[PDB]
Amino acid sequence: FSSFPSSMDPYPDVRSPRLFPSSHAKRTSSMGLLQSKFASPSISRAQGSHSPRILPVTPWSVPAPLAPTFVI
Amino acid sequence: MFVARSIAADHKDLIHDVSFDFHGRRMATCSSDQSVKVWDKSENGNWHCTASWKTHSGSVWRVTWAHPEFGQVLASCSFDRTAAVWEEIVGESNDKLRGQSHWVKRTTLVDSRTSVTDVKFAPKHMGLMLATCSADGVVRIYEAPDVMNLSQWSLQHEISCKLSCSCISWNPSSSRAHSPMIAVGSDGKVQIYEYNENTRKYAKAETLMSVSDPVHDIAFAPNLGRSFHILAVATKDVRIFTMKPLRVTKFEIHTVAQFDNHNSQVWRVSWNITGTVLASSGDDGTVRLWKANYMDNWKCIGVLKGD
Amino acid sequence: FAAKFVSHKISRTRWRPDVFATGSWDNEENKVCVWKQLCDIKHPGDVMDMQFLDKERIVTGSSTGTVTIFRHHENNQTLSVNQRWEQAHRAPCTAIVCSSPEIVSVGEDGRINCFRAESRDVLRTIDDADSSTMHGVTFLRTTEILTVNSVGQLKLWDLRKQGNDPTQIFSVTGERVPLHCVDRHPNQQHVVATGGQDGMLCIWDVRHGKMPMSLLNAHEAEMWEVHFHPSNPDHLFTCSEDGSLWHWDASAEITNLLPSSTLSVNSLDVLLVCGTDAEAIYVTRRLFS
């Protein structure tokens, strides 16, 4: 039923195109890796070290309002 | 007429890996000379090299062949921190002849921040999928989500390990019958991995204990006609582990056998196509073939030597 | 019926131009012997086209579009290496028949390439890129031809005029089978019959319309081959792809009357053997009884 739930989540179609809608998706508390890769690419766009430490920090917190902060 | 004789690889520097295709007719080699050679076993029995090209900037540790349904694809692995996918190309004009074959790059995987030890294609049922493990100690899985786009390689997953040696080996079990899982042997404690239901993430089901020395090699055996699974490690000792799922947790290991008759490092461990025979090689310069007993103990059938 | 099994999953054998020879795939040395055995020769490259072009001369088309010819001087037991060709079809020819001054050949991709007698120069070529495997081939009124693709696609073509189009087309309503069997009558150079995959008995009237003059399924698997009598047109017998020749007594019956219950059969000429789908090992020696 997880796939069905994912489909339902994708069914909302809140707006095009948003990382804020990506956060609306993380509302379920489950985040796809692709998003993480995109975030890493954005970070890339000492910096590498920060990403390594920033990514670790994001990993440390999975709680609501933490992922948003980690993403920021 | 047929003869098996020693043949020169044509590699200036040392040869890290040799791999057979699906048929067993073709061989791929890689070395520290930065070149990949592909051999054709002619119908006249002599191996002749099909092609050799400069794949990478730095030494090429590992190579592998994908399933022949996808096409002629070889993946390579280097100290340059890249993996490359290559597709064999033959062109023939809608007329007899006119076909030309040369190595080509489908894609590059830059994501590994450090020198990569190994690369392996997953089983054919899964799709184009491969795993790689590096000095960053991060196992990465890449998929081609479109079979048609051989350049479209997405990064499916990333997991953390430890730091030093590395080897990978997928479960070759056909899926429908079994679930995907993969053993990683680095350096020393080594922990394998399985795949979760719809988390779609790799979990650590269990670990292979009793490992001695650095883990030179690991391979999973084809589970054809057997419920249980077998993995052999060439440490500086040979070990065989039996995995059984049963049914939270759903894994068990037993250690089938240990074998030190090499008296030294076991560099390579390889399995038969059926999983019937295991092989081991080491610093004694001896290659041992193994059979399973009725008791499920392993016995050495015989030993090849060389000097 | 004597079955001198000689341990080679034989691809071909034919009546002497008692007298005979044989040819086989499925080994390192491509296997072909004469005859109690005359000239058991090895060669590299398969046997797709097979016609002993004299008591000496003997031609053979091989798997890579290759075509080997030699001359079996049985007196000195020596074979003069008559002719060689690299890329005919590189698939093999998927049938072989004879034409006046040339072989009525065809191949799977359809490279209708005409080697002819002393035409080491391959002059003529209808290089129509036949998509399905053309395995139906004969001279009808040479050079009246008909390429039959593996949609059973009996398109009547030409080679004496030019242009790569086919002259006509014979087909069943559905196009179910791939090409294995046809039947050009010795009674008439126009009369034919499509032997197909269901033990499928079809008959092709050229001169009288072109409908399915027959549709009758008797044998189990796909169309193997037959042995007509080389002067008795009516007497023949029909198999299917396991090899089981039912005594399709059109001289007058058909039953379980072969030396049957084996694997497949090799090639057809009888005055004696036939050919099934998997081309396997069998023998016979009493072909008038």
Swiss-Prot record, chain B:
SMART domains: WD40 (SM00320)
Subcellular location: Chromosome, Centromere, Kinetochore; Nucleus, Nuclear pore complex; Lysosome membrane
Gene Ontology terms, MF aspect: structural molecule activity
Chief localization: nucleus
GO BP terms, alphabetized: attachment of mitotic spindle microtubules to kinetochore; cell division; cellular response to amino acid starvation; cellular response to nutrient levels; mitotic metaphase chromosome alignment; mRNA transport; nuclear pore organization; positive regulation of TORC1 signaling
GO cellular component, one term: GATOR2 complex
Name recorded for this polypeptide: Nucleoporin SEH1-A
Source organism (scientific name): Xenopus laevis (African clawed frog)
Phylogenetic lineage: Eukaryota, Metazoa, Chordata, Craniata, Vertebrata
